[PDB]
Design a protein around this ligand. Structure first.
Ligand code: CLA
Ligand code: CLA
Ligand code: CLA
Ligand code: CLA
Ligand code: CLA
Ligand code: CLA
Ligand SMILES: CCCCCCCCCCCCCCCCCC(=O)OC[C@H](CO[C@@H]1O[C@H](CO)[C@H](O)[C@H](O)[C@H]1O)OC(=O)CCCCCCCCCCCCCCCCC
Ligand SMILES: CC1=C(C#C/C(C)=C/C=C/C(C)=C/C=C/C=C(C)/C=C/C=C(C)/C=C/[C@@]23O[C@]2(C)C[C@@H](O)CC3(C)C)C(C)(C)C[C@H](O)C1
Ligand SMILES: CC1=C(/C=C/C(C)=C/C=C/C(C)=C/C=C/C=C(C)/C=C/C=C(C)/C=C/C2=C(C)CCCC2(C)C)C(C)(C)CCC1
Ligand SMILES: CC1=C(C/C=C(\C)CCC[C@H](C)CCC[C@H](C)CCCC(C)C)C(=O)c2ccccc2C1=O
Ligand SMILES: CC1=C(C/C=C(\C)CCC[C@H](C)CCC[C@H](C)CCCC(C)C)C(=O)c2ccccc2C1=O
Ligand code: SF4
Ligand code: SF4
Ligand code: SF4
Lengths: 79, 659, 86, 329, 130
């Protein structure tokens, strides 16, 4: 390095550099696989946020909707 | 809507996240669900940021080598892969045959080292786990969207027999808008139990990692020493663990206060507020909740900014000359932003959330404040005027006398009150020791007194502007009917004498300049006293010392970074010093020159484009017809340029001077 | 487009109508005041938002109010000349 | 500069009060081409400086625009005096010396042209669009000095010839500051100084001839001209000669910063603050019957402009005069 | 000892290099080994071009060069119109002698605040008219 700091030059502070890179190609690939999973989930989340709630679902969607018993208890308790 | 101008993009981007303003966001249920999903996405972003920092430390950096010799070594942030750099010869950031690297000024190395990270494998495992946590956060967002959709479907499919079925309209967002249960679980589990868990982590991982000899975890790991261990120059890890244990126990106890899951136990926040001094307010108001959270976060961010520097909690953090200053300045700026944010959202609450009673009725705290807002503002103005007049006048007296060469003629008021408080604190600490604290007590002189009064002036004026905006947001003598208009509107016309900057958003715009000033004053004070304690003590009583011994003197390395002689590792800092100066100057344009001139100029440019031979036959100008930025849009853009330049031109200076 | 509203405090002096640059306003018969007329805003689609009516209003606080709506900007309210949205 | 912006102002006033000449009837092409030439000039001239900065920072001087690197020779800058070779000296000083033009002179001269053209653009737009425009068609009825026509039509701020001057003054001040800095640095580096012994003299210049090497970069201007040559004024407090100049430097900085108050803020905030303050006076029975009012919009602009220009000019004045006084004595 | 063996042994606070002096000795050895005082930029970019008397080297104004700029590239500037200075001195000395003879007496320094009678005044001199 060509240090430009007065304190660095005075005290001889150094930026030690390893001989070998910390992570290997396989480790970087695994991290990238996890990042890809994150990206897919994030795209799905962005789509959901963009489209918001769909109150029409009760007209065509399968099932009859459900409220968890704890959610019902919270509703009964109130705010 | 095909009929649109180029102002469409700016109008949209100014309210992209203003979910309350969204079209077809019918109800509070939609609002709350959207906000919850946005919160989940935000947590995912934070976790990805943590994972990226950890990954780059593990891969591009030298954590293993640094932990061997932390004092002289400098951590690496990440590699530089920039094609624009010179290829003929090695760059200042390389070892003449090595990848270019950047030093890290975030203290994350000290954080990991005192947390108990010994090998890059542990950092890699953390990178992986935080990425998994981001996945979990996004999936939880999706899960909750689905659950709330399933409740709407249910409510649609099932109906109570009596006509009161419409009452269920209010309880669909109970899970997101309930306050008692949220308070209980946040303060008990998210705070107290989190502290207890971190105590467990310390005892299991951090203490054995720091201690060379093995010793079984026991109460010996909990201690009440104080001050900094000499070897690491940081707070004893054993004390941090007890600290967090004590706070966790206290907050776990406090987390049983409200009735959360059953009505048999706990008290109600409505009931406390009703029976307390503050009559009651719209606790349901999301803007009010945001304001309170932002105020608390601002005070906590200021507290951490001061205390991380005062009492070093991280191994060898004090030895890092640059990282200390960077951390202090970073968290001071974040705290100032959060404070002004709380004020702005209180103003928005008043604009569009508070349900004011009839004029003569005075039952709520907000109405009582609005009764004498005039007195509040007048007294705040008086305090600001006094502070400014006398601070500036004493500084100018000292300036003139020093310029004439007579330091003995300077007015030097000894800080007797602060010195007495400091002496009492020192007496208590000395008694405790008889039964070291570095940077918790500082010499304190007349220069400190003057700088403290200047910072008080800054705070008082910022609060003056913000309070005036908040209390005139609903109405004003100049604009009585300000409730009908939006939070931020251009003006009210040149009539009534002229109505520039008449909105509560315009008061925020104005208070932003002050925040930046008062934060600049605070940062300059800290940096000057840090760089040159003796020179600051002797010479900080007149402003020429600040202008010469601090700025002009310490500006040399940065500007000399790259020149005709060559370049060094601060060349990037020197280029960002100038880029940010240019950004500030550009912001001046949007702040000074207003919209009519630019609209006419845009009209002329559009005429030229429509008269050009080839371009006219393709581009009509009908779609996204170019227009000059609106008044509020330009105010905001100029403010953004000003803020970016002001904030970003400092870190280069502090790094250059402290490195 | 902007929203131009008139309130009964109106005294029917016609100054707003005379100050209108694009003829958005017109006086209409009324019994609320002594002048027996009140300004109306039928052609609010042409209102540009200059607030010259507001400048010319005498009443203690304005009997005519122009609320700007930047989201609903039209070519008439923007005074577009070189480009046409019609 | 001041009298040129004045000429623009009174041209606008004449257009408002009297019938303009027929060149106003094709004003759109005129101002459009002036806008284009201003944009192109600014882009090229200032982006050469920015290119030099970026490349030099990256470590590639061979890629920058300078005499040693890619050079922009001023071919048209030709002599006409036909002087004899050498310089003229008088008692240890260089009374006269030829100025040698290179890439730095090319770049700075095109910066000068850019700034002059932008100031002219503002003045000419104010003059030609004084009577009416596409935005507002009754600007003649509005007059000469009005703040706006309203928030309408997007916003008609500073559409008046008065405001066009209010901006042209900023631009004239910018142009003249750059001209002053160019003259000062070039004279110090390449003309003025002393000499040390047909006889040949080695000329020791006050700035050491650093204009041709450092002026090619904005960082060079910031370091070798402002920071480096502000040593005299910044360190003038103890010295009997120039302590006043140092104090005026500081005070001019203060005044320039204080102008930003009026340049950024608006009338309504101050009117509301004044009313809130006046509440207390009325409470205590201090009733001023000349009711306090916030400064009008045009007055606020004028005050801001005056303080801005005065502060900048004072800083430059003190800096240059301190440097010259110390160097010559 | 020496930088080679210092770096071969290495530094580790955790195990042996518990001495700040040893730590900074190793740091200084590493600095000397791996750090350079300057980037090594070509000295030519630092040399002046205009006003240093070396303008002709760059050939900036080759087509129709300006005569006033010296052709020599050594960096020295000749004095323009050297030949006239002896002539000017001779002319001024000759004029001094001529006026001295014309007056007939030695030149007397004028007084900034003094008052002198006109040579043609009709009244008796108070202060010598010269
Ligand atoms: C022509 C000038 C130039 C250019 C084009 C670049 C380009 C680059 N430099 Mg830089 N650099 C320059 C000059 C330049 N440099 C100079 C003069 C120096 C000093 C000697 C440096 C010193 C330097 C260093 C030390 C480093 C770089 C790095 C980089 C790379 C950044 C990559 C990155 O993460 O981008 C991402 C960019 C951003 C996050 C900033 C975005 C900001 C804008 C305003 C957008 C904000 C987002 C907004 C929402 C809009 C999104 C729109 C989009 C979706 C379409 C890139 C190749 C870094 C590198 O190597 O990275 C691998 C790096 O470490 N440069
Ligand atoms: C823009 C916002 C911002 C930014 C950019 C930063 C930046 C920084 N802060 Mg932070 N900070 C902020 C706002 C911000 N802060 C605010 C508002 C506050 C007040 C609350 C703080 C309070 C604060 C403190 C008190 C400290 C920092 C520190 C730091 C550094 C980060 C260290 C790090 O990431 O270690 C990497 C992280 C780890 C190794 C572990 C993180 C552990 C957490 C708990 C992870 C999240 C838990 C997860 C969700 C749990 C899963 C669920 C399960 C339990 C069920 C850096 C300078 C530290 C510092 O200065 O270090 C020198 C520091 O001590 N900040
Ligand atoms: C801040 C002061 C405060 C005040 C004025 C009240 C007032 C009230 N609380 Mg209480 N409460 C408080 C704090 C407070 N609380 C705290 C901190 C908690 C969390 C532990 C609770 C949890 C709580 C519950 C769950 C309930 C109440 C209820 C009540 C009512 C009856 C009180 C009673 O009978 O006390 C007399 C009783 C005692 C003094 C015995 C208390 C013993 C336990 C262990 C708590 C003590 C904890 C201690 C202060 C902290 C230890 C710290 C650690 C370091 C050792 C009354 C309205 C009841 C009610 O009617 O609600 C509608 C109810 O159901 N409170
Ligand atoms: C679509 C855009 C968007 C995005 C990206 C976010 C992002 C965020 N919102 Mg949300 N929000 C949005 C829109 C959005 N919001 C809208 C439209 C509204 C309606 C007005 C809200 C209303 C809202 C509220 C009411 C709150 C948030 C909060 C948050 C945070 C979510 C959780 C988190 O990660 O906190 C990470 C935060 C931390 C790790 C810091 C924790 C410490 C807290 C903030 C301070 C606690 C202080 C305490 C009360 C008092 C201490 C006392 C002591 C000093 C003695 C995050 C910053 C919460 C927040 O933290 O606000 C500051 C919050 O309270 N938002
Ligand atoms: C150096 C520049 C400068 C100066 C001297 C001032 C001075 C002032 N500003 Mg500030 N202000 C500035 C820049 C500056 N401002 C900028 C750039 C902005 C952004 C537009 C603002 C925006 C602003 C607002 C919105 C407000 C102030 C207020 C004030 C007053 C604060 C109290 C005080 O110090 O009284 C002492 C007076 C002086 C130090 C002035 C010098 C007097 C003689 C020479 C002594 C004072 C008149 C507040 C106010 O009016 O409080 C009553 C207020 O509400 N200012
Ligand atoms: C440094 C501050 C600054 C800057 C950059 C500008 C820039 C400009 N002003 Mg000025 N202006 C300023 C301050 C500034 N102003 C202030 C404080 C005021 C208030 C008094 C004004 C008032 C004002 C008026 C009233 C007018 C101007 C005009 C102009 C334009 C001149 C012509 C042009 O664009 O050529 C030069 C452009 C530049 C130098 C901009 C930077 C270009 C760089 C070097 C190259 C870009 C490289 C690359 C493509 C970037 C990509 C980035 C991306 C990938 C992220 C230009 C946009 C005039 C105009 O618009 O005429 C057409 C005009 O009428 N200004
Ligand atoms: C980098 C460190 C240093 C710099 C730090 C950042 C700069 C400081 C912050 C700026 C200070 C103000 C902050 C407050 C923000 C809210 C204000 C607001 O909404 O009002 C901004 C207002 C909102 O708009 C107004 O709203 C009113 C209703 O209240 C009315 O409808 C008005 O007519 C309407 O104009 O004005 C605008 O519309 C502004 C135009 C915005 C144009 C931006 C488009 C370009 C974006 C590019 C950048 C990417 C953005 C994402 C960033 C990524 C970050 C991860
Ligand atoms: C279809 C069908 C049938 C069938 C069938 C049969 C027999 C199908 C067999 C399928 C078979 C045998 C499929 C193997 C997949 C292996 C995978 C995906 C491995 C990935 C491994 C990965 C992604 C690992 C990656 C890494 O971690 C590694 C290893 C190193 C780390 O550094 C990091 C990385 C990321 C680099 C029936 C049942 C007969 C009838 C039915 O009717 C129809
Ligand atoms: C390695 C490998 C592989 C793969 C690869 C790849 C293909 C990768 C990719 C990668 C990538 C490509 C990545 C990326 C990532 C990204 C991310 C991670 C991001 C995220 C985001 C977030 C988190 C956020 C978001 C948001 C926004 C910003 C706005 C709003 C909305 C939201 C919130 C959503 C394979 C399997 C073939 C084989 C084996 C190996
Ligand atoms: C310069 C300036 C302008 C003119 C500037 C304008 C119109 C913006 C210039 C456009 C910039 C260069 C960004 C355009 C870049 C690309 C065209 C982006 C297109 C991508 C879209 C899809 C978003 C104003 O309109 C104005 C209004 C009020 C006060 C001050 C000012 C002001 O200072
Ligand atoms: C501050 C400010 C005000 C408020 C400023 C006012 C009312 C000026 C006060 C005038 C005083 C009373 C004149 C007397 C002169 C000074 C008090 C002299 C001080 C001299 C010192 C050396 C002591 C506006 O009204 C305004 C309007 C439009 C745009 C910007 C602004 C603006 O910036
Ligand atoms: S258009 Fe501009 S100058 Fe005119 S009143 Fe509105 S904000 Fe003020
Ligand atoms: S709106 Fe105003 S000006 Fe028009 S008639 Fe009513 S009171 Fe008169
Ligand atoms: S704002 Fe202007 S155009 Fe609109 S009604 Fe009022 S006077 Fe007419």
């Amino acid at each position: 390095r060509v240090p430009g700091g007065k304190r660095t030059k005075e005290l001889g502070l150094v930026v030690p550099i390893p001989e070998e890179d910390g992570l290997t190609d396989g480790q970087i690939a695994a991290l990238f696989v996890v990042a890809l999973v994150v990206l897919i989930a994030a795209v799905d989340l962005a789509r959901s946020l963009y489209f918001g709630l769909q109150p029409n679902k009760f007209k065509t969607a399968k099932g009859k909707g459900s409220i968890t018993p704890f959610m019902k208890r919270l509703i009964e308790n109130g705010f | 809507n095909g009929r649109c101008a180029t102002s469409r993009y700016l109008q949209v981007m100014g309210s992209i996240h203003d979910i309350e303003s969204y079209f077809a966001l019918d109800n509070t249920l939609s609002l709350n669900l959207q906000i919850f999903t946005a919160h989940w996405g935000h947590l995912a972003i934070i976790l990805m940021w943590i994972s990226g920092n950890l990954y780059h430390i593990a891969s591009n950096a030298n954590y293993s080598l640094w932990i061997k010799n932390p004092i002289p070594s400098m951590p690496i942030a990440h590699n530089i892969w920039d094609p624009h750099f010179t290829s003929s010869t090695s760059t200042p950031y390389s070892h003449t045959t090595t990848a270019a690297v950047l030093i890290a000024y975030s203290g994350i190395y000290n954080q990991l080292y005192t947390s108990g990270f010994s090998t890059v494998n542990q950092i890699y495992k953390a990178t992986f786990a935080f990425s998994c946590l981001a996945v979990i956060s996004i999936l939880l967002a999706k899960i909750h969207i689905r659950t709330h959709s399933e409740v709407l479907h249910n409510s649609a499919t099932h109906a109570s027999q009596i006509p009161s079925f419409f009452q269920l309209l209010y309880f669909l967002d109970v899970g997101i808008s309930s306050i008692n249960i949220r308070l209980n679980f946040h303060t008990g589990v998210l705070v107290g139990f989190f502290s207890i868990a971190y105590t467990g982590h310390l005892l299991d991982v951090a203490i054995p990692a720091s201690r060379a000899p093995l010793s079984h975890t026991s109460l010996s790991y909990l201690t009440f020493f104080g001050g900094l261990k000499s070897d690491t120059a940081s707070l004893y890890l054993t004390d941090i663990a007890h600290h967090h244990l004590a706070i966790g126990v206290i907050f776990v106890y406090i987390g049983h206060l409200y009735s959360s899951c059953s009505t048999a136990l706990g008290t109600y926040i409505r009931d406390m507020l009703y029976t307390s001094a503050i009559y009651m307010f719209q606790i349901k108001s999301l803007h009010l909740a945001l304001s309170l959270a932002l105020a608390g976060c601002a005070v906590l961010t200021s507290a951490t900014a001061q205390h991380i520097y005062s009492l070093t909690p991280y191994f060898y953090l004090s030895y890092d000359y640059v990282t200390s200053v960077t951390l202090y300045v970073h968290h001071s700026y974040i705290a100032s932003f959060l404070a002004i944010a709380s004020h702005a959202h209180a103003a928005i609450t008043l604009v569009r959330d508070w349900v004011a009673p009839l004029e003569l009725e005075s039952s709520c705290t907000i109405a009582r404040i609005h009764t004498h807002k005039a007195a509040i503002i007048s007294h705040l103005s008086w305090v600001s005027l006094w502070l400014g007049f006398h601070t500036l006048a004493i500084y100018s007296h000292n300036d003139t006398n020093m310029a004439f060469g007579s330091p003995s003629k300077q007015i030097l008021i000894e800080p007797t009150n602060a010195q007495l408080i400091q002496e009492s604190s020192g007496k208590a600490l000395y008694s405790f020791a008889i039964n070291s604290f570095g940077s918790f007590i500082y010499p304190i002189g007349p220069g400190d007194l003057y700088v403290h009064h200047a910072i008080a002036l800054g705070l008082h004026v910022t609060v003056l502007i913000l309070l005036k905006g908040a209390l005139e947001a609903r109405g004003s003598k100049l604009m009585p009917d300000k409730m009908e208009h939006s939070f931020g509107f251009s003006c009210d016309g040149p009539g009534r004498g002229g109505t520039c900057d008449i909105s509560a958003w315009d008061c925020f715009y104005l208070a932003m300049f002050w925040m930046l000033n008062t934060n600049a004053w605070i940062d300059f004070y800290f940096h000057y006293k840090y760089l040159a304690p003796r020179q600051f003590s002797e010479s900080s009583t007149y402003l020429e010392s600040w202008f010469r011994d601090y700025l002009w003197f310490n500006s040399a390395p940065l500007i000399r970074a790259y020149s005709a002689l060559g370049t060094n590792d601060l060349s990037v800092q020197a280029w960002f010093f100038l880029l940010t100066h240019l950004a500030w100057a550009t912001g001046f344009m949007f702040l000074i020159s207003w919209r009519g001139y630019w609209q006419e100029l845009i009209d002329i440019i559009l005429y030229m484009h429509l008269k050009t031979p080839i371009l006219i036959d393709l581009w009509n100008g009908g779609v996204y017809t170019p227009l000059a930025l609106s008044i509020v849009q330009a105010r905001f853009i100029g403010l953004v340029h000003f803020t970016a330049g002001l904030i970003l031109t400092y870190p280069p200076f502090i790094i250059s001077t402290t490195s | 487009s902007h929203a131009v509203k008139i309130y009964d405090t109106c005294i029917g002096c016609t100054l707003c109508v005379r100050a209108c640059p694009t003829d958005v306003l017109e006086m209409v018969p009324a019994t609320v005041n002594a002048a027996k007329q009140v300004a109306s805003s039928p052609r609010v689609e042409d209102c540009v938002g200059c607030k010259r009516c507001e400048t010319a209003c005498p009443t203690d606080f304005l009997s005519i109010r122009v609320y700007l709506q930047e989201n609903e900007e039209t070519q008439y309210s923007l005074g577009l000349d070189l480009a046409d949205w019609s | 500069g001041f009298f040129t912006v004045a000429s623009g102002a009174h041209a606008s006033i004449f257009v408002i009060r009297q019938l303009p000449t027929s060149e106003i009837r094709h004003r759109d092409p005129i101002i459009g081409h002036l806008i284009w030439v201003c944009i192109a000039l600014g882009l090229h001239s200032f982006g050469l400086y920015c290119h030099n900065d970026t490349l030099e920072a990256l470590g590639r001087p061979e890629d920058t625009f300078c005499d040693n690197s890619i050079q922009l020779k001023p071919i048209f800058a030709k002599q006409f005096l036909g002087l004899q070779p050498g310089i003229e000296v008088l008692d240890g000083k260089i009374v006269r010396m030829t100025q040698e033009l290179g890439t730095a002179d090319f770049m700075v001269h095109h910066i000068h042209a850019f700034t002059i053209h932008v100031t002219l653009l503002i003045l000419l737009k104010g003059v030609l669009y004084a009577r009416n425009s596409r935005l507002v068609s009754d600007k003649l009825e509005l007059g000469f000095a009005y703040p706006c026509d309203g928030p309408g039509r997007g916003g008609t701020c500073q559409i008046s010839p008065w405001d066009h001057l209010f901006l042209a003054v900023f631009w004239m001040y910018n142009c003249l500051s750059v001209v002053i800095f160019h003259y000062f640095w070039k004279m110090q580096s390449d003309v003025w100084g002393s000499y040390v012994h047909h006889s040949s003299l080695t000329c020791s210049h006050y700035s050491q001839g650093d204009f041709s090497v450092n002026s090619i970069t904005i960082n060079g201007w910031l370091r070798n001209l402002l920071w480096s040559e502000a040593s005299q004024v910044i360190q003038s407090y103890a010295l009997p000669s120039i302590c006043s100049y140092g104090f005026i430097f500081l005070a001019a900085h203060f005044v320039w910063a204080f102008s930003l108050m009026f340049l950024f803020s608006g009338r309504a905030y101050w009117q509301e603050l004044i009313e809130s303050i006046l509440w207390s006076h009325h409470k205590l029975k201090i009733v001023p019957h000349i009711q306090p009012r916030a400064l009008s919009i045009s007055q606020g602009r004028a005050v801001g402009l005056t303080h801005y220009v005065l502060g900048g000019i004072g800083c430059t004045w003190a800096f240059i005069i301190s440097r010259m006084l110390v160097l010559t004595t | 000892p020496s930088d080679e063996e210092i770096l071969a042994k290495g530094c580790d606070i955790r195990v042996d290099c518990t001495t700040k002096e040893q730590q900074f000795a190793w740091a200084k050895a590493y600095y000397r080994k791996y750090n350079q005082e300057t980037d090594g930029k070509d000295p030519k970019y630092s040399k002046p071009s205009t006003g240093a008397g070396v303008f002709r080297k760059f050939k900036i104004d080759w087509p129709n060069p300006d005569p006033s700029i010296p052709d020599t590239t050594d960096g020295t500037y000749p004095i323009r119109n050297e030949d006239f200075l002896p002539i000017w001195k001779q002319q001024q000395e000759d004029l001094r002698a001529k006026m001295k003879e014309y007056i007939g007496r030695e030149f007397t320094e004028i007084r900034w605040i003094g008052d002198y009678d006109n040579a043609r005044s009709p009244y008796k001199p108070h202060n010598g008219y010269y």
